[PDB]
Coordinates of C-alpha atoms and ligand atoms in Angstrom, one line a residue:
X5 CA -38.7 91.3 7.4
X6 CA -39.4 89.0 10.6
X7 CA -38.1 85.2 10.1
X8 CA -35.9 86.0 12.9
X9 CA -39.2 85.9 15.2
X10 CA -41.0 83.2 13.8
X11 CA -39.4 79.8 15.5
X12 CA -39.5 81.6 18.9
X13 CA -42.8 83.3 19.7
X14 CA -44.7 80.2 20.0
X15 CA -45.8 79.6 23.4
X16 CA -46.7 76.2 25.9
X17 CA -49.4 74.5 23.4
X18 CA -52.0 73.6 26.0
X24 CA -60.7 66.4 19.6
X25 CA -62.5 66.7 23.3
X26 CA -63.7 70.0 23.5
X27 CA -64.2 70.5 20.2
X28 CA -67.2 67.6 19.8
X29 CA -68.2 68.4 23.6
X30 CA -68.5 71.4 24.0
X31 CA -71.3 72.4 21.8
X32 CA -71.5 69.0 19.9
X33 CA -72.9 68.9 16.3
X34 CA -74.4 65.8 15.8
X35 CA -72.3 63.1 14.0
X36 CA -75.0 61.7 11.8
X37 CA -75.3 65.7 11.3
X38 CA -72.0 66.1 9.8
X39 CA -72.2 63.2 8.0
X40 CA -75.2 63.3 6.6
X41 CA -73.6 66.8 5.6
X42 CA -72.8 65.8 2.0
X52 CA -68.8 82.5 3.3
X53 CA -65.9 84.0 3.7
X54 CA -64.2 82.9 6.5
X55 CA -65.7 79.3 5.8
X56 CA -63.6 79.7 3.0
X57 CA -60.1 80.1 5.0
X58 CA -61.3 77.2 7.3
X59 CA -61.5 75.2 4.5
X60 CA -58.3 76.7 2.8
X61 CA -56.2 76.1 6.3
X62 CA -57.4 72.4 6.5
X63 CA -56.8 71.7 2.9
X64 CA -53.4 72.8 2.8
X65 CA -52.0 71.2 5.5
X66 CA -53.2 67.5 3.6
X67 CA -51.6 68.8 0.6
X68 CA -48.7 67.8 1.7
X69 CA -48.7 66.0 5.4
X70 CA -50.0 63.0 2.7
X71 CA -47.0 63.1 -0.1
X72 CA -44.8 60.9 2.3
X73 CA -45.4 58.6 5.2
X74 CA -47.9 59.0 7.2
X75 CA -50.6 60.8 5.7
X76 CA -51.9 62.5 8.3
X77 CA -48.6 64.3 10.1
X78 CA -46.4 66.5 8.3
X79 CA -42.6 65.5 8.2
X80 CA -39.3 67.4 8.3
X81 CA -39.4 68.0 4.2
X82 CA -43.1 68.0 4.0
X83 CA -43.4 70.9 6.6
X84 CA -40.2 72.7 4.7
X85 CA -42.0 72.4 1.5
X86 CA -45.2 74.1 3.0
X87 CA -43.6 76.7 4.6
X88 CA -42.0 77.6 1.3
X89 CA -44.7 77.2 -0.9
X90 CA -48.0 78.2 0.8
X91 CA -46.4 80.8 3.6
X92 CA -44.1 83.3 1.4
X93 CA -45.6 86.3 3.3
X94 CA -42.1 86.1 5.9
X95 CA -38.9 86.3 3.7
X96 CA -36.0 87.2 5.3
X97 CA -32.9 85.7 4.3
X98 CA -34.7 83.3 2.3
X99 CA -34.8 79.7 4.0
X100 CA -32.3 78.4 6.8
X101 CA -31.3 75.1 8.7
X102 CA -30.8 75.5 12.6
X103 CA -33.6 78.7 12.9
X104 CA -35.8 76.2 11.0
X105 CA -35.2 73.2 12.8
X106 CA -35.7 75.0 15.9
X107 CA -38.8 76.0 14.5
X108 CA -39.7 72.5 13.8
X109 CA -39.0 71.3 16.7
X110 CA -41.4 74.3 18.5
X111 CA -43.7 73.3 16.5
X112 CA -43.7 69.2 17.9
X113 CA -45.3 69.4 21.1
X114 CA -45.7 65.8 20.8
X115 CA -41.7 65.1 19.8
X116 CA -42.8 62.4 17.5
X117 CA -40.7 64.4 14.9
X118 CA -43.7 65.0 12.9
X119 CA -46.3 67.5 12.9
X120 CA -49.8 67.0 13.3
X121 CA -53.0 68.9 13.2
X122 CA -53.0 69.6 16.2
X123 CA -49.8 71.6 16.4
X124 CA -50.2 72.6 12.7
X125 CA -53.1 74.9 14.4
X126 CA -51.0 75.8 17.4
X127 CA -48.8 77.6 14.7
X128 CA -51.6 79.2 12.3
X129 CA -53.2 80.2 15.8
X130 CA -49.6 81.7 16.6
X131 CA -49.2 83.6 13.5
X132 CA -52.4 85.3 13.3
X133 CA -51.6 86.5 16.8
X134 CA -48.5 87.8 15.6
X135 CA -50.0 89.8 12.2
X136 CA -53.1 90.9 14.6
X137 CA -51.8 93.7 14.9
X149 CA -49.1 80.2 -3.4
X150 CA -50.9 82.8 -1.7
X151 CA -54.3 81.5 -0.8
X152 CA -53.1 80.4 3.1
X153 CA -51.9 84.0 3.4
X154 CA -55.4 85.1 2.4
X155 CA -57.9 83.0 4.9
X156 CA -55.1 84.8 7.5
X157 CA -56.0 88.2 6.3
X158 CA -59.4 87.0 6.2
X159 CA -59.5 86.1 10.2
X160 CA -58.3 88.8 10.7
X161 CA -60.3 91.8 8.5
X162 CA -63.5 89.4 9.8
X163 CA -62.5 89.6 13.5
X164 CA -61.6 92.8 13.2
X165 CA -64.7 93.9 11.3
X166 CA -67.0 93.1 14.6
X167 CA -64.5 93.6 17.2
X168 CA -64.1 97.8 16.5
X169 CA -67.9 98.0 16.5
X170 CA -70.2 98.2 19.8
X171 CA -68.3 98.1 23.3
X172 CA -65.0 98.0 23.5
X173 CA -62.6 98.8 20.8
X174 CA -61.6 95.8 18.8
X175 CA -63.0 93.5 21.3
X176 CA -65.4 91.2 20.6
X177 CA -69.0 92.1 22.5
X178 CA -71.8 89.6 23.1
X179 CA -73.7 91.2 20.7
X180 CA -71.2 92.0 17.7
X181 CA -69.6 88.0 19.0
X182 CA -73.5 86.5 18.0
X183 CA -73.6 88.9 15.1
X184 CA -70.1 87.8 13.6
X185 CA -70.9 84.1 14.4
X186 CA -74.7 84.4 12.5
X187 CA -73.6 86.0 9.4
X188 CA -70.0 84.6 8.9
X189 CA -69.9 81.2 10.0
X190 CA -73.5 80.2 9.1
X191 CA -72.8 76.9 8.2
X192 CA -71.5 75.8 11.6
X193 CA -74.9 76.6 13.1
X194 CA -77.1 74.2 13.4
X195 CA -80.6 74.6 11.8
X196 CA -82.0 75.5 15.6
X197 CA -79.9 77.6 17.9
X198 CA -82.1 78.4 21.1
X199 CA -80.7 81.2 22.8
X200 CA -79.7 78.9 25.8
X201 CA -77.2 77.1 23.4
X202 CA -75.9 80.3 22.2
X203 CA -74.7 81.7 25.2
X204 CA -74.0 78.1 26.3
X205 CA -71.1 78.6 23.2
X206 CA -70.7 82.4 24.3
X207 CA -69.4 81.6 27.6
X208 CA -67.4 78.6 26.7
X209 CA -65.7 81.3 24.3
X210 CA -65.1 83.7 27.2
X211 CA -62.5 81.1 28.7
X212 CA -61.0 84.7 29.6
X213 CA -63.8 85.9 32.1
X214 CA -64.0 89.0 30.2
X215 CA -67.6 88.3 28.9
X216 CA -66.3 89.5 25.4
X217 CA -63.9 87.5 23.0
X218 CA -60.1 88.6 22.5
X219 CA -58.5 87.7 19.5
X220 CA -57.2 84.0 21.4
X221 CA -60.2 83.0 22.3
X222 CA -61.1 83.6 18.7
X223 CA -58.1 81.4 17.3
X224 CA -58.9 78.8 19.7
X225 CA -62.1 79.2 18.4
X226 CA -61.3 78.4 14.7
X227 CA -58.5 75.7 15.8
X228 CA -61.7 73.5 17.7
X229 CA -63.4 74.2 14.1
X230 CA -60.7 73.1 12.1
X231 CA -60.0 70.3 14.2
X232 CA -63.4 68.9 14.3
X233 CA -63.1 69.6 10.1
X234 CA -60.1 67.7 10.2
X235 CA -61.8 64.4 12.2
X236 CA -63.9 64.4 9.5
X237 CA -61.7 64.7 6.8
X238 CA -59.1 62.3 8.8
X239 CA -60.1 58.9 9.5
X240 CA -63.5 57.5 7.5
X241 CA -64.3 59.4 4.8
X242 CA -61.2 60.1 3.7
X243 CA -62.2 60.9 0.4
X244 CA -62.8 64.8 1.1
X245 CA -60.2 65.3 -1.4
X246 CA -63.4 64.4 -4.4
X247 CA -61.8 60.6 -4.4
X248 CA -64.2 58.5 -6.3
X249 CA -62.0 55.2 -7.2
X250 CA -65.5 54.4 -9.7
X251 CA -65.3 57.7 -11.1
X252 CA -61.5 57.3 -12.1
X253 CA -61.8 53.9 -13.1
X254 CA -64.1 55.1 -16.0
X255 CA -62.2 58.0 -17.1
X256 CA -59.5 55.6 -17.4
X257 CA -61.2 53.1 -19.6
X258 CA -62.7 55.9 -21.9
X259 CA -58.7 57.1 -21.8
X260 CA -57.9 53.9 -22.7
X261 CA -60.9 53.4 -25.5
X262 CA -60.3 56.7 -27.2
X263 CA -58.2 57.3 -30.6
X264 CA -54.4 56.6 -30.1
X265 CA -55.5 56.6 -26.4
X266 CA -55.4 59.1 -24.0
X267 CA -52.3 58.8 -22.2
X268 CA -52.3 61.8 -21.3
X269 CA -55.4 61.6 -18.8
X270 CA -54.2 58.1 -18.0
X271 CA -51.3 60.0 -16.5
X272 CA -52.7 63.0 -14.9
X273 CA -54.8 60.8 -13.3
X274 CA -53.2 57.7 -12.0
X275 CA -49.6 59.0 -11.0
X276 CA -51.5 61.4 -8.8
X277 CA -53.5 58.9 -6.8
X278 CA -51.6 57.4 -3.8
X279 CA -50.6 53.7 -4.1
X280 CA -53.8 53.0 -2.1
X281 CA -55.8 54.8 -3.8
X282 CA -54.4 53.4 -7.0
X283 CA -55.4 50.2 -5.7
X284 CA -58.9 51.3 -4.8
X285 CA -58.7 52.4 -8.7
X286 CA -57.7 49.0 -10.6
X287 CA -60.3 47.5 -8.0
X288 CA -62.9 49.3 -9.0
X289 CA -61.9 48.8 -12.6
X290 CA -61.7 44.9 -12.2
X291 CA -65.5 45.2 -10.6
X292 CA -66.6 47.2 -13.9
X293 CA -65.3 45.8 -16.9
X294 CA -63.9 42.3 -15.1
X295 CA -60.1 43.3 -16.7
X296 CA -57.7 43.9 -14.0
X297 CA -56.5 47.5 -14.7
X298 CA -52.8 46.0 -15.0
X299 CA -53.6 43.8 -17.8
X300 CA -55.5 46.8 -19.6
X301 CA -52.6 49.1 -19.8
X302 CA -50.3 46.7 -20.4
X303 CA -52.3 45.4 -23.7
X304 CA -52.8 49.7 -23.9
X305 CA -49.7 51.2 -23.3
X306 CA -45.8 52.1 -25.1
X307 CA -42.3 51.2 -23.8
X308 CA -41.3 53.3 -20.4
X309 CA -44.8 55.0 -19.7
X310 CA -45.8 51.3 -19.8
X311 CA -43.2 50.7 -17.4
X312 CA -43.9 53.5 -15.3
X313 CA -47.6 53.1 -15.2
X314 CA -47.1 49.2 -14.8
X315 CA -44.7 49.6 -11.6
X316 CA -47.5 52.8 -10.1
X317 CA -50.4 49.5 -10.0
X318 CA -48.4 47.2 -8.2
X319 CA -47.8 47.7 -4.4
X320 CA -45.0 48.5 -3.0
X321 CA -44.5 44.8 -1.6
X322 CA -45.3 43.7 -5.0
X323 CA -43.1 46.0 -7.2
X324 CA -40.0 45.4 -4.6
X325 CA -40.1 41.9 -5.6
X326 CA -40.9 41.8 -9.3
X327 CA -38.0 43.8 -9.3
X328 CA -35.9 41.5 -7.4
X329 CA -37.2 38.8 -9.5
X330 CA -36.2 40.7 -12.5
X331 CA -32.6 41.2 -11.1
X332 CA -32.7 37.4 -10.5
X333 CA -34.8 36.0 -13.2
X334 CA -32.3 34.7 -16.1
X335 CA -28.9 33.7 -17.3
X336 CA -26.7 36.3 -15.1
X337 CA -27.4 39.1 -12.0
X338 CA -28.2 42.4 -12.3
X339 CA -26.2 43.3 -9.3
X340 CA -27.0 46.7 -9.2
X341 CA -30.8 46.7 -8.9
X342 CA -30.3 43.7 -6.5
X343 CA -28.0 46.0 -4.5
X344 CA -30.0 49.0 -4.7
X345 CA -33.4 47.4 -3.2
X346 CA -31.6 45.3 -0.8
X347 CA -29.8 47.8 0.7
X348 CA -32.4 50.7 0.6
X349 CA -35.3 48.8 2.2
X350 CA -35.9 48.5 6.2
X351 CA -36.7 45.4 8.4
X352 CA -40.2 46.2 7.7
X353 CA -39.9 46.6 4.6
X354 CA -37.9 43.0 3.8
X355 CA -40.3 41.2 6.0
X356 CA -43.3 42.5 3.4
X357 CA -41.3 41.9 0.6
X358 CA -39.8 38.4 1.7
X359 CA -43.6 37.2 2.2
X360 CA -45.0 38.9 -1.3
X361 CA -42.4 37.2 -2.8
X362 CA -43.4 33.8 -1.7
X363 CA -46.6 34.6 -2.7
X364 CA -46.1 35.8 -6.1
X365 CA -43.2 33.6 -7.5
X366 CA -43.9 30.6 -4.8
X367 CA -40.6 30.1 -4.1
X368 CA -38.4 32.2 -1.3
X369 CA -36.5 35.7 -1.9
X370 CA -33.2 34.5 0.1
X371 CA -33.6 30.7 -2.0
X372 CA -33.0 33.2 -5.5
X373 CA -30.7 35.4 -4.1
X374 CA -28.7 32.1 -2.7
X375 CA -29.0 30.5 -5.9
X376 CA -28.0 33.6 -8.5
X377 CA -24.9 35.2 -6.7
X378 CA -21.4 33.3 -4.3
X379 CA -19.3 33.9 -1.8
X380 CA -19.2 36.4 0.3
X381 CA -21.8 39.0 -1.6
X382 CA -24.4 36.0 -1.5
X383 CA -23.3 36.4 1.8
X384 CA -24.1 40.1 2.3
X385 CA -27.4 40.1 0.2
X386 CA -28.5 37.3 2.1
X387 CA -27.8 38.7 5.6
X388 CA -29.2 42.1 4.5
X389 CA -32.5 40.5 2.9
X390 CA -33.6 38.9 6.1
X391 CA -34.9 42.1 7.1
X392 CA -33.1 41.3 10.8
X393 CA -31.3 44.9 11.3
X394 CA -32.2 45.3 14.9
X395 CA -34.2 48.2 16.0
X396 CA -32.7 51.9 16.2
X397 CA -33.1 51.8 20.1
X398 CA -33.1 54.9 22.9
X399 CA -29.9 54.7 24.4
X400 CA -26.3 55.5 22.8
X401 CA -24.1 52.3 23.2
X402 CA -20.8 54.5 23.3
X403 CA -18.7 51.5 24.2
X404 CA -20.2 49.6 21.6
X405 CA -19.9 52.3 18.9
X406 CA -16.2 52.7 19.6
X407 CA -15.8 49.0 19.7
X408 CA -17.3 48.5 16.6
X409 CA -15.4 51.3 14.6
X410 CA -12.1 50.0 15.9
X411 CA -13.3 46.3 14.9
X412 CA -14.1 47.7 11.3
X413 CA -10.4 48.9 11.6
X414 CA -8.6 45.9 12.6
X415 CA -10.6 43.5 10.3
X416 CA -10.0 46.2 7.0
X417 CA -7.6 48.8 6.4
X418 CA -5.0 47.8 9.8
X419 CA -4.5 43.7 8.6
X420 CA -3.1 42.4 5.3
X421 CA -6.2 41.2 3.6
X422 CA -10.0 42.3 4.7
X423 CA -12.2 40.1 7.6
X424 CA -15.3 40.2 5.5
X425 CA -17.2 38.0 8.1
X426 CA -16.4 40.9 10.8
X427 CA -17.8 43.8 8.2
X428 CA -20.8 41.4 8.0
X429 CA -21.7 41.1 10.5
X430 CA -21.4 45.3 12.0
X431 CA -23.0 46.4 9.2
X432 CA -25.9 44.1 8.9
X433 CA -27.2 43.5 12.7
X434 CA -26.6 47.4 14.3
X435 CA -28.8 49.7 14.1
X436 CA -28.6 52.4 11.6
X437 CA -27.7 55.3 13.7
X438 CA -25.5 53.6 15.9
X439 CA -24.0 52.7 13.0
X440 CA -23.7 56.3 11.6
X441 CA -22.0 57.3 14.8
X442 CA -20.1 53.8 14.5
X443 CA -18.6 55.3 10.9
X444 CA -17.7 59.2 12.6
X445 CA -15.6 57.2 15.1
X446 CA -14.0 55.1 12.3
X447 CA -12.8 57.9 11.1
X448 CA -10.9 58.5 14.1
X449 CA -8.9 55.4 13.5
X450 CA -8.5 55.5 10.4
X451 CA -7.2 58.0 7.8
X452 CA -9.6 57.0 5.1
X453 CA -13.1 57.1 5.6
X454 CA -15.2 54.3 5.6
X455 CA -16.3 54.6 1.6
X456 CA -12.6 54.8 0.8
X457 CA -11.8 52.1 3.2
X458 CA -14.3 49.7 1.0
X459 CA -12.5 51.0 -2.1
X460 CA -9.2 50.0 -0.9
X461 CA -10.0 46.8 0.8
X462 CA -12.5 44.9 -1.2
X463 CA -13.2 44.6 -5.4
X464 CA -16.3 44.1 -7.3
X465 CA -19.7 43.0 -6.1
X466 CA -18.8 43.1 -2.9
X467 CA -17.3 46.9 -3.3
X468 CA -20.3 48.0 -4.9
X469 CA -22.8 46.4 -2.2
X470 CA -20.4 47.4 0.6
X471 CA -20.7 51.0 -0.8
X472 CA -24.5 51.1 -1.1
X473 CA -25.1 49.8 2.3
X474 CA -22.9 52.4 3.5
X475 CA -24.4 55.6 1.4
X476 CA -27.6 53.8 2.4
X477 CA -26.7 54.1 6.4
X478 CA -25.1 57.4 6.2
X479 CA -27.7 59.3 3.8
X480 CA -30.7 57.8 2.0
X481 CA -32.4 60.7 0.0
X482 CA -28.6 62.0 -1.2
X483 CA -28.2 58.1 -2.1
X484 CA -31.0 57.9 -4.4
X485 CA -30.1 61.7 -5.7
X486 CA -26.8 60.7 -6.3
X487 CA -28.4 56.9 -8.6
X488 CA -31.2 59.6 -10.3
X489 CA -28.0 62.1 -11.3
X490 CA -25.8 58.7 -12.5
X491 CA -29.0 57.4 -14.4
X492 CA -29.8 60.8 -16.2
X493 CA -25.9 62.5 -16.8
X494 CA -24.4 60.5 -19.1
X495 CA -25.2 59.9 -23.3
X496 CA -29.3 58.9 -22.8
X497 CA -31.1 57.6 -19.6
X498 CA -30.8 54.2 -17.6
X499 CA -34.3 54.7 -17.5
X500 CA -34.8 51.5 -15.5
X501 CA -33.3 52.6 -12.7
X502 CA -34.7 56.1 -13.0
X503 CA -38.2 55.1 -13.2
X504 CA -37.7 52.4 -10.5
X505 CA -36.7 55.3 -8.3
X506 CA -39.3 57.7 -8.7
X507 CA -41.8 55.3 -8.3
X508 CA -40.7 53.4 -5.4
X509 CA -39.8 56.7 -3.3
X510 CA -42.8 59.1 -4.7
X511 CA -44.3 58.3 -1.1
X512 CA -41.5 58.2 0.7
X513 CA -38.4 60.6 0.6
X514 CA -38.9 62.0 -2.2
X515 CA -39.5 66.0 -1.3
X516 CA -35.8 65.0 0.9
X517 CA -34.8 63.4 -2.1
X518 CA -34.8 66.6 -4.2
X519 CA -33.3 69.3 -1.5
X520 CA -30.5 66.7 -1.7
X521 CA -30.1 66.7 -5.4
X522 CA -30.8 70.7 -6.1
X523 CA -28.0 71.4 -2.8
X524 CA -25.6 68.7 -4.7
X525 CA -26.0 69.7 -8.3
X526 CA -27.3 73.0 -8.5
X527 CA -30.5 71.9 -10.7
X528 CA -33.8 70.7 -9.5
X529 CA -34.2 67.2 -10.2
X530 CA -37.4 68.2 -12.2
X531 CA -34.6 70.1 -14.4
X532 CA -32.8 67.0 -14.9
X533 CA -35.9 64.4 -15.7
X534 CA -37.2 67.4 -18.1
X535 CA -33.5 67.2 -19.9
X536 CA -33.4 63.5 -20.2
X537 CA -36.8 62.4 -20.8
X538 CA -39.4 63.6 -23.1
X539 CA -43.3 63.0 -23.7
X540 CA -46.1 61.9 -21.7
X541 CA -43.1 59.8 -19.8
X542 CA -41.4 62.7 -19.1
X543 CA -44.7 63.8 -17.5
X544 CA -45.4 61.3 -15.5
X545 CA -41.6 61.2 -13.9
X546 CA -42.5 64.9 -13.4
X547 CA -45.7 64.1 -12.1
X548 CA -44.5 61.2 -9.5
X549 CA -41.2 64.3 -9.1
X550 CA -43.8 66.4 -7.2
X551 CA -42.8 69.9 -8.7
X552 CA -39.4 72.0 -9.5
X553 CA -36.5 71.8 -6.7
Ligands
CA601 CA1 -46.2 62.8 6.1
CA602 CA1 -46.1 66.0 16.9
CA603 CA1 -66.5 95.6 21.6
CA604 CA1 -63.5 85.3 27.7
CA605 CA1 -52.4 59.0 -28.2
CA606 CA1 -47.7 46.7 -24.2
CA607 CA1 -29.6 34.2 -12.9
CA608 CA1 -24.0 40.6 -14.1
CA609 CA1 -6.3 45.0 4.2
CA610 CA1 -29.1 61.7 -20.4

């Protein structure tokens, strides 16, 4: 019972020493292909598990740091999880304040909590394990529970044998033994020893991190083939065409259909299209293509024909960033040789061409440093005076505020709004606009306010009603697999009461079903 004490007792955090002091060769380590070798491997492992489900692959993110505490890190219970205690801990936990968590600090905290017990489940073991090994040594020759020179060499010979290089002249060794004893002690305390195993699990992690980044057994050759067996089999084997490629990242799905292409000189696409049924075609299909690349084949879709599909228009034009568009805008000259904003202008009017095409030039300026207080009030009272105040609605005015701000200055811009006006900015749309133009305007704004509930809120309208939109579904869950999608969920279970796996499991059924569930990530 301790959660209470878990986002405080984390001291002032303060790889360089790692490969300097005592520096294993690189060609060593590289031309490198046990208990506590074990954890080490465990405490690195885990932390990539998820720090590479969304954005950057390499730091763990608000929802991707909940999801590991939940899942891996049990042992503390408590009242179950939290909000404010947890984002304190998060934020104890970001020495760096880049909002994310990196290895670095990821250490900081294991360090931290094997101080504290010093006194899945298989994280919670390699911490027992530290401990029993340290503990093992440390209660032997000298001082109780307190690592001597002599039970330190022991416990570093057989324990971490690995680690030592093939020769080990006794000048080296107690070159390491007194860079240990950063104390002055001339033993080890249990600090020194978790300082110890962070340098270890850094220098692991450069490794891993970087080059070579196929640690994780990632031969694109080797899944190639088992596709193409999966593909010449009886019936095929969709199932391992699944299992594999919708758990690959996009770029390592790329790496994949390249490496197919260079075997059997059929691009991968063209394979499983010619091999595959209906929506786990469509699913599989939209997995190859990049993001870029899907973003505007959808677009193109929306555009491509007699009428608009408005909604899928709306939906990636108002959930993509300046980033984002700019990729997309460029793919799409590429692919279709002809410009996004030319088929947007030339497949919808007035003033929602208007909005699509000011949205789609991926302008949005920056979210900046400072709060323009001034401009947020001004800006909430102009959204006033141009919709619910006049006879009629300034569309130009709405434009314009909601396309060029930033996105939080424009979520503070919508609180103050609601200061001048008795109905909220969504219901203010509703009353002052019809249509298209309502339907973008309330996008945009869900989009601004809160992204993951926005797409929770589409998944829940695809899957509720008699069947599935499963076009929209799909086009979700792949487009946001590697993005939001762990935030995407906690939105959906808090809204609905269900796990979004629950509702993809009810709606959907076969190998489809599991690879939504798949690109899902797991239940809640
Ligand atoms: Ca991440
Ligand atoms: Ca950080
Ligand atoms: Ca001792
Ligand atoms: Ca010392
Ligand atoms: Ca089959
Ligand atoms: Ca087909
Ligand atoms: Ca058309
Ligand atoms: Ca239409
Ligand atoms: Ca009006
Ligand atoms: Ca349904």
């Amino acid at each position: 019972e301790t959660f209470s004490d878990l986002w405080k007792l984390l001291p002032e955090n303060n790889p360089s020493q790692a490969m300097d002091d005592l520096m294993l060769s690189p060609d060593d380590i590289e031309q490198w292909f046990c208990p506590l070798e074990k954890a080490l491997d465990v405490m690195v492992s885990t932390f990539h598990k998820y720090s590479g489900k969304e954005g950057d692959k390499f730091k763990l993110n608000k929802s991707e740091l909940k999801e590991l505490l939940t899942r891996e890190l049990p042992s503390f219970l408590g009242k179950r999880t939290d909000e404010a205690a947890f984002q304190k801990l998060m934020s104890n936990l970001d020495s760096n304040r880049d909002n994310e968590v990196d290895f670095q600090e990821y250490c900081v905290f294991l360090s931290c909590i094997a101080m504290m017990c010093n006194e899945a489940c298989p994280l919670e073991k390699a911490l027992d394990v530290m401990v029993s090994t340290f503990h093992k040594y440390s209660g032997k020759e000298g001082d109780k529970f307190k690592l001597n020179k002599s039970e330190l060499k022991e416990l570093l010979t057989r324990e971490l044998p690995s680690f030592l290089g093939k020769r080990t002249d006794e000048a080296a060794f107690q070159k390491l033994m007194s860079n240990l004893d950063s104390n002055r002690d001339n033993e080890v305390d249990f600090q020194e020893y978790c300082v110890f195993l962070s340098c270890i699990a850094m220098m692991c992690n450069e490794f891993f991190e970087g080059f070579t980044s196929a640690y994780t057994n990632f031969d694109a050759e080797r899944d190639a083939l088992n596709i193409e067996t999966a593909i010449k089999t009886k019936g095929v084997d969709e199932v391992t065409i699944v299992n594999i490629l919708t758990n690959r990242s996009n770029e390592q799905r790329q790496d994949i259909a390249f490496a197919y292409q260079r075997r059997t000189k059929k691009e991968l696409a063209s394979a499983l299209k010619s091999a595959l049924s209906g929506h786990l075609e469509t699913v599989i299909l939209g997995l190859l293509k990049t993001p870029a690349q899907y973003d505007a084949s959808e677009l193109k879709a929306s555009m491509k024909g007699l009428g608009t599909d408005e909604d899928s228009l709306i939906e990636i034009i108002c959930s993509r960033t300046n980033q984002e568009l700019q990729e997309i805008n460029r793919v799409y000259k590429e692919m279709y040789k002809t410009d996004l904003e030319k088929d947007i202008i030339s497949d919808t009017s007035g003033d929602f061409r208007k909005l699509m095409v000011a949205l789609a030039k991926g302008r949005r300026a920056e979210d900046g440093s400072v709060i323009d207080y001034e401009l947020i009030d001004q800006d909430a009272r102009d959204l006033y005076d141009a919709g619910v105040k006049r006879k009629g609605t300034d569309v130009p005015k709405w434009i314009s505020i909601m396309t060029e701000r930033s996105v939080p200055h424009l979520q503070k811009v919508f609180d103050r709004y609601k200061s001048y006006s008795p109905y909220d900015m969504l219901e203010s749309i509703r009353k002052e606009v019809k249509g298209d133009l309502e339907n973008a305007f309330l996008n945009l704004v869900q989009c601004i306010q809160n992204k993951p509930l926005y797409f929770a809120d589409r998944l829940y309208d695809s899957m509720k009603g008699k069947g599935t939109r499963d076009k929209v579904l799909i086009r979700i869950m792949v487009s946001r697999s590697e993005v939001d999608m762990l935030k995407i969920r906690s939105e959906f279970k808090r809204k609905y009461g269900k796990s979004l796996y629950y509702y993809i499991q009810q709606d959907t059924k076969g190998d489809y079903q599991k690879a939504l569930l798949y690109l899902c990530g797991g239940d809640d």
